[PDB]
Amino acid sequence: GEWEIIDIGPFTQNLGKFAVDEENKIGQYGRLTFNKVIRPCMKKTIYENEGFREIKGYEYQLYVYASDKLFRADISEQVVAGGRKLLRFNGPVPPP
Numbered sequence: 001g002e003w004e005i006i007d008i009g010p011f012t013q014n015l016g017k018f019a020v021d022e023e024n025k026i027g028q029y030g031r032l033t034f035n036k037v038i039r040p041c042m043k044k045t046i047y048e049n050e051g052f053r054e055i056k057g058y059e060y061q062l063y064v065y066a067s068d069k070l071f072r073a074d075i076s077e078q079v080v081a082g083g084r085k086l087l088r089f090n091g092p093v094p095p096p
Contacts, residue, residue: 006043013037016064019073022086035065040096063096070095
């Protein structure tokens with residue numbers, strides 16, 4: 001895995017909306033209203049450990065406000081677009 005911080009622009013905010021949408025299906029935290037994704041947002045790029053030295057997927061680690069509480073959500077993304085999954089959604093957590 002390799003790590004980088006990405007901005008919290010539209011792509012990142014939409015990851016946050018996805019996370020909230022998916023958590024609403026579960027219902028652990030009742031019915032949440034997405035507010036906004038705040039810094040820092042981390043992107044993990046996952047590589048196959050042997051040649052051809054290749055990317056097998058991504059994971060995003062977000063701090064997202066929903067219904068005015070702060071949550072940590074981890075989201076996986078496949079190489080073939082449109083395979084996103086909510087891995088973890090935990091909180092409330094203290095601010096970064």
